[PDB]
Design a protein around this ligand. Sequence first.
Ligand SMILES: *C[C@@H](C)C(=O)n1cc(C)c2c(-c3ccc4c(c3)CCN(C)C4)cncc21
Ligand SMILES: [Mg+2]
Ligand SMILES: [Zn+2]
Length: 199
Amino acid sequence: GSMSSSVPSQKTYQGSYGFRLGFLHSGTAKSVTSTYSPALNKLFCQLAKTCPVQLWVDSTPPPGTRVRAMAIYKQSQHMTEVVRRCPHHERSSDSDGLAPPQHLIRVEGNLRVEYLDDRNTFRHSVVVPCEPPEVGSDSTTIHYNYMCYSSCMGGMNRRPILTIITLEDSSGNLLGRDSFEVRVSASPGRDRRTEEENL
Ligand SMILES: *C[C@@H](C)C(=O)n1cc(C)c2c(-c3ccc4c(c3)CCN(C)C4)cncc21
Ligand SMILES: [Mg+2]
Ligand SMILES: [Zn+2]
């Protein structure tokens, strides 16, 4: 376990541009590879499958704006432990060539992706340029991939995580923040349906 001496803020912050996340409304059929529970504010997804996350604003942010994703453990007693891939998957060398093998969160389909091992906090994050919607689209979507199961021993080790999405300007200053819980499992639709029944 790499231990950090800080914890990233999780405070929701729409900021000047009205930043917030959206998710597809995918339902809980057996065939779904990712599904989002609004009641739990929790994303359920399969290992290394595309998770679309929409980025919404009310006004266009300045040029060079970027969007960063970072995972932390949800439980207070684990929050200072850096979220990382388990030993097996890190050594599996399943990298797309861009992502460090230790990083839990990847972005797919974006050649401008940038990965950070923070030299002071030791936290991992992934950042991409933030684009307005393309011609013929009404949304900006990032395709995230979670590269370990929540049950991966020596990684998340059955502990729940939060993903924190931050909108930043070109200089790294905070423009907006949103977050959601994540469970990575082989049966996201069933797992979402079950957890919502336990409400
Ligand atoms: C970097 C991302 C957050 C960004 O600059 N961004 C995302 C979105 C969705 C967006 C818009 C935008 C907002 C709302 C609508 C539309 C575009 C298109 C039409 N529908 C109805 C609403 C604008 N600028 C930037 C931006
Ligand atoms: Mg929300
Ligand atoms: Zn793993």
